[PDB]
């Protein structure tokens, strides 16, 4: 509300809010946050990166997005929970100072503005993005099948109106083009992660083909070290392991995309529930659920550093 203080972090908020939330957290700490204006959305909204960071020029950073899908609500609320736990735990907990000494981090908490504000407006499970099309009725795109990576292979629809459409061509989505040219024009992430749920899954390259990627074994050892931090708060199980063999195939999506841009540590999280609640996770799960995240964030993040 009037500070990051007061802010009610154990309910969902709107996109107002959420944005008025990043405005609060730069002002408090101007000389660790900065608000970044990437791009604009579909439908003019702009497109927000909070950027943390000590100092130094293009230092190594790591990069986190949440809420691609627009209805998995339990992302975008743990967006805004990271983003305020970074500013208390630097100085405090000794091993996320040493990272953000070193490394600088990149938060979106909205990457689809338009399909959230969607959701609040109109359709609570809306997932895609709100372009329009002339060839069809239907709209918007699967942002995330919309990466150059296996673009329009099995694993996604050429048909606008499906839920998984991959859109006219790799990039299309402003919203996605956006973050394609940042991270490229930057050029030293050396992590990835998006945040989605729900499924409980920590997962890796790839989704759009069956080739193991050369890294399969520090990656899989780094996944299963943060799955173990991650249970060890509240014994959330998760499982682990790339895309295609945990899940299905699936094209376009972006950790593949990051992955072959030469960023390593490419990973995908699918948090809280099994399928009790699904997208409509209760308001007071969001506090544990983004406590628990957290530790297996640090535990990759630390392997990165």
């Given at each position: 509300?009037?500070?990051?203080?007061?802010?009610?972090?154990?309910?969902?908020?709107?996109?107002?809010?959420?944005?008025?939330?990043?405005?609060?957290?730069?002002?408090?700490?101007?000389?660790?946050?900065?608000?970044?204006?990437?791009?604009?959305?579909?439908?003019?909204?702009?497109?927000?990166?909070?950027?943390?960071?000590?100092?130094?020029?293009?230092?190594?950073?790591?990069?986190?997005?949440?809420?691609?899908?627009?209805?998995?609500?339990?992302?975008?609320?743990?967006?805004?929970?990271?983003?305020?736990?970074?500013?208390?735990?630097?100085?405090?907990?000794?091993?996320?100072?040493?990272?953000?000494?070193?490394?600088?981090?990149?938060?979106?908490?909205?990457?689809?503005?338009?399909?959230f504000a969607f959701t609040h407006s109109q359709n609570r499970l809306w997932r895609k993005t709100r372009s329009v099309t002339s060839s069809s009725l239907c709209v918007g795109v699967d942002a995330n099948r919309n990466w150059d990576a296996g673009f329009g292979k099995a694993g996604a629809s050429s048909s606008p109106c499906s839920e998984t459409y991959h859109g006219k061509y790799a990039n299309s989505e402003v919203e996605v083009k956006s973050i394609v040219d940042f991270v490229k024009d930057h050029g030293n992430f050396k992590?990835?992660?998006?945040?989605?749920?729900?499924?409980?899954?920590?997962?890796?390259?790839?989704?759009?083909?069956?080739?193991?990627?050369?890294?399969?074994?520090?990656?899989?050892?780094?996944?299963?070290?943060?799955?173990?931090?991650?249970?060890?708060?509240?014994?959330?199980?998760?499982?682990?392991?790339?895309?295609?063999?945990?899940?299905?195939?699936?094209?376009?999506?972006?950790?593949?995309?990051?992955?072959?841009?030469?960023?390593?540590?490419?990973?995908?999280?699918?948090?809280?529930?099994?399928?009790?609640?699904?997208?409509?996770?209760?308001?007071?799960?969001?506090?544990?659920?983004?406590?628990?995240?957290?530790?297996?964030?640090?535990?990759?993040?630390?392997?990165?550093?």
């Amino acid at each position: 509300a009037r500070s990051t203080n007061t802010f009610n972090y154990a309910t969902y908020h709107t996109l107002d809010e959420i944005y008025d939330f990043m405005d609060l957290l730069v002002a408090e700490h101007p000389q660790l946050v900065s608000k970044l204006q990437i791009g604009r959305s579909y439908e003019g909204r702009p497109i927000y990166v909070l950027k943390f960071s000590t100092g130094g020029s293009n230092r190594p950073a790591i990069w986190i997005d949440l809420g691609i899908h627009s209805r998995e609500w339990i992302t975008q609320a743990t967006g805004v929970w990271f983003a305020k736990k970074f500013t208390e735990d630097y100085g405090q907990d000794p091993s996320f100072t040493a990272i953000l000494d070193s490394m600088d981090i990149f938060l979106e908490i909205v990457t689809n503005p338009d399909g959230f504000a969607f959701t609040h407006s109109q359709n609570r499970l809306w997932r895609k993005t709100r372009s329009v099309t002339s060839s069809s009725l239907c709209v918007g795109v699967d942002a995330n099948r919309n990466w150059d990576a296996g673009f329009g292979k099995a694993g996604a629809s050429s048909s606008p109106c499906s839920e998984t459409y991959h859109g006219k061509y790799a990039n299309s989505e402003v919203e996605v083009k956006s973050i394609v040219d940042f991270v490229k024009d930057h050029g030293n992430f050396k992590a990835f992660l998006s945040i989605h749920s729900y499924s409980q899954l920590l997962l890796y390259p790839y989704g759009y083909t069956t080739q193991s990627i050369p890294d399969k074994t520090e990656l899989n050892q780094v996944a299963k070290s943060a799955v173990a931090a991650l249970k060890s708060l509240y014994g959330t199980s998760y499982k682990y392991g790339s895309i295609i063999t945990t899940i299905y195939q699936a094209s376009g999506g972006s950790i593949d995309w990051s992955y072959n841009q030469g960023i390593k540590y490419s990973f995908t999280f699918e948090l809280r529930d099994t399928g009790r609640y699904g997208f409509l996770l209760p308001a007071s799960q969001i506090i544990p659920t983004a406590q628990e995240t957290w530790l297996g964030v640090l535990t990759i993040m630390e392997h990165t550093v």
